[PDB]
């Protein structure tokens, strides 16, 4: 990667698989070297070694090595030291849930558990931030609203509340995007939507400009412009 970044100038992205297996491998090497294993059976040099791996990953003036790591936390105990060391390095987390995939949403990314630390207002732009905050609030409220709305009945919704439900379920479907790689796999031609156009799309959906169009006309669509087309074909 460093050859690409430094010596070919390219911005690159280097995937790592289980960083659990990075830890596990390091832990073994310590024991083999005969060093006294530290807390919860983890090498004493755990922090520093990971530090070397995750500080060689950086944005230089020539390039940037972005790194996608896979964290297969053991026991599901986030309190465990190996996850903790990982979390120290992490900047963003994408939390692909199977529940989400079970809602027929591919991407499988759970929007309420997907969080980034560079989601900061200044960093992402104020407009983007405000739009994002609204989508987060909308979804957050939607989830909570659906908890007792489903149980009590949908008629119990206020005009304001079902407005939120309407926007939200449309956003939820609008999230669904087929992937170019998975053009074969789903059978549906993929969609790649650029960042500027992403902000634009959510801004309109929040203002419900196109909300009056079926939710399954927002299912598996591309950008805002695209789902104008899909709306027409769905209706036809």
């Amino acid at each position: 990667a460093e050859y690409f970044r430094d010596e070919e100038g390219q911005d690159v992205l280097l995937f790592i698989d289980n960083i659990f297996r990075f830890t596990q491998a390091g832990s073994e090497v310590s024991a083999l070297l005969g060093r006294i294993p530290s807390a919860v059976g983890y090498q004493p040099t755990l922090a520093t070694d990971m530090g070397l791996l995750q500080e060689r990953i950086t944005t230089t003036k020539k390039g940037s090595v972005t790194s996608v790591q896979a964290v297969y936390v053991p026991a599901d105990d986030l309190t465990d030291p190996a996850p903790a060391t990982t979390f120290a390095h992490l900047d963003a987390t994408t939390v692909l849930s199977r529940g989400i995939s079970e809602l027929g949403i591919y991407p499988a990314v759970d929007p309420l558990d997907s969080k980034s630390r560079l989601l900061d207002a200044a960093v992402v732009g104020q407009e983007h931030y405000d739009v994002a905050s609204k989508v987060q609030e909308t979804l957050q409220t939607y989830k909570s609203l659906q908890d007792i709305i489903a149980i009590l009945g949908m008629d119990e919704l206020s005009e304001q509340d079902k407005l939120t439900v309407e926007r939200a379920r449309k956003i939820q479907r609008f999230l669904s995007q087929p992937f170019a790689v998975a053009e074969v796999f789903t059978g549906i031609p993929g969609k790649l939507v650029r960042l500027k156009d992403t902000v634009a799309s959510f801004k309109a959906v929040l203002e419900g400009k196109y909300d009056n169009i079926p939710e399954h006309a927002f299912y598996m669509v591309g950008g805002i412009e695209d789902v104008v087309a899909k709306a027409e074909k769905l209706a036809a």
Binding site: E28, A31, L32, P37, A75
Partner: protein, 303 residues
């Protein structure tokens, strides 16, 4: 069959059982019994794997059952500790992960260059109080793909095999499932899923939908019981599951499910052995066969 740390008496019963089912004519039993020394116990799965390789290399298929690697672990532990090699977690060797991984990676399904052969493997791990969190289980769970997790409650509840279907997964799974059985068993997965959720409702005033699920679930549970040491043919797996899927069995009284099953099999064998032979030989369920199959089930349900 790789008998690791198993009493010579127990393995004698195993050998005897194999002889009863006259299965020695394709079996090899690599035996490292409890009595056998800790180096032998250590090398016992490794040695066994090599035996498998000749068959695999010849392009054939074979199944090696490592039972139980949990005792293999203990032997490696014994060696390492006695050789004073650095101890590690749960007093298990530091390279125990490496040991297990080495064994478990020497089994595979090979390229057509290599004559497409394979060595299927089925490691057995003994859980100490079901603690999958335990170091030797956690390691093995990671290395393997797919798990079957038998659960004590189910065993006690007379569900033999006692497979806890919640705690059973097979990553490769349906990739190797026969097409016929695949077609008629997507539903079965979903029904059982509902049955798990609707389980706690077993204790009064219950919605009809909930009750329908409950009826399906109980009858299904009886269907998935099987008499130990009496395996069943695939050509008889497929009809039975179709019936349950079509809810034909739902009506049948819970107690009468067992009798119904055997009777249904005999009924199919007498009445519709054209169907059975077709299912077996085609290895697929044609819509025309499924038509006939529904009819047969209906007739059997009637009497």
């Amino acid at each position: 069959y790789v008998a690791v740390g198993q009493k010579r008496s127990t393995v004698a019963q195993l050998v005897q059982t194999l002889e009863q089912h006259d299965a020695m004519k394709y079996s090899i039993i690599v035996a490292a019994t409890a009595s056998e020394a800790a180096p032998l116990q250590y090398l016992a799965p490794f040695t066994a794997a090599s035996i498998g390789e000749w068959f695999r290399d010849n392009g054939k298929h074979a199944l090696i059952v490592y039972d139980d690697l949990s005792k293999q672990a203990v032997a490696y532990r014994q060696l390492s500790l006695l050789l004073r090699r650095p101890p590690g977690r749960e007093a298990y060797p530091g390279d125990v992960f490496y040991l297990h991984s080495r064994l478990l990676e020497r089994a595979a399904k090979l390229s057509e260059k290599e004559g497409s052969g394979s060595l299927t493997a089925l490691p057995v791990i003994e859980t100490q109080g079901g603690d999958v969190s335990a170091y030797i289980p956690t390691n093995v769970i990671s290395i393997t793909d797919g798990q079957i997790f038998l659960e004590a409650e189910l065993f006690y509840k007379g569900i033999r095999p006692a497979i806890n279907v919640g705690l059973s997964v097979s990553r490769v799974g349906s990739a190797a499932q026969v097409k016929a059985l695949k077609q008629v068993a997507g539903s079965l997965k979903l029904f059982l899923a509902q049955y798990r959720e609707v389980a706690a409702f077993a204790q009064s005033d219950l919605d009809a939908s909930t009750k329908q699920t409950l009826v399906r679930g109980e009858r299904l549970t009886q269907l998935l019981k099987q008499n130990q040491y009496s395996p069943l043919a695939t050509e008889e797996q497929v009809p039975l599951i179709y019936a349950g899927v079509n809810g034909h069995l739902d009506g049948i009284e819970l107690s009468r499910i067992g009798e119904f099953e055997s009777s249904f099999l005999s009924y199919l064998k007498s009445n519709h052995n054209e169907l059975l032979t077709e299912i077996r030989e085609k290895g697929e369920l044609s819509k025309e066969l499924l038509a006939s199959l529904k009819s047969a089930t209906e007739s059997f349900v009637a009497t």
